[PDB]
């Protein structure tokens, strides 16, 4: 799964 803290940040898996 992905963590995405803002709309324009890249997701971290």
């Amino acid at each position, epitope marked *: *799964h*992905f*963590v*995405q*803290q*803002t*709309p*324009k*940040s890249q*997701p*971290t898996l």
Partner: antibody
Amino acid sequence: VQLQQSGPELKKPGETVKLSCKASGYTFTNFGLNWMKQAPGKGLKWMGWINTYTGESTYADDFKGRFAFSLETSASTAYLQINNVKNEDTATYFCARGFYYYGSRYFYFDYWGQGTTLTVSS
Amino acid sequence: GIVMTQTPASQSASLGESVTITCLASQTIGTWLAWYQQKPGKSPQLLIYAATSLADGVPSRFSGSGSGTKFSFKISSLQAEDFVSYYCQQLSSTPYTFGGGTKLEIKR
């Protein structure tokens, strides 16, 4: 869920401050933390933010140089450091949680700290 | 980067009346827009997100409208507690600019 900030700070010109923002009630690394400045009779200014999962900090143009965000993840705490303080730093500082996640439709700041005062004086 | 203009700076009204505050964005901002209240000596508190959505536990009198660049915030019948400051904020691209704020005061 709470954001709890450290107490009032008194600093002489040229000193350093470090102020904390403790989050509780949720997984700390899920959401990022935003820092705002409010000068005495003035409006809110967004200084930048820190990714709580990644450690990557982003600074607004007016806050490059003397300003440094950091994390102590095990104590669920974010910090704001201002180096070489001057008269213009006298203000109240707030942290706020950025509510967003992967697949979210919405973005806003839901929880805010109670704010912390910095006063610069010789 | 992107400027948020909030008129007017000061607004006079009375108990039970309704008021409307504007906020004009410099660029198209979609609906990535929030409204906050700030009482004297306290921190901001979210009232409206996504331009039109009421935050949880916030009273029915508060509402928001708009999308693109033109945005409004309405209170439908004012109580004593309401006469404080309000800020809009753009959440589309960094830096996430706040409006300059409006203070509601009581007419006499």
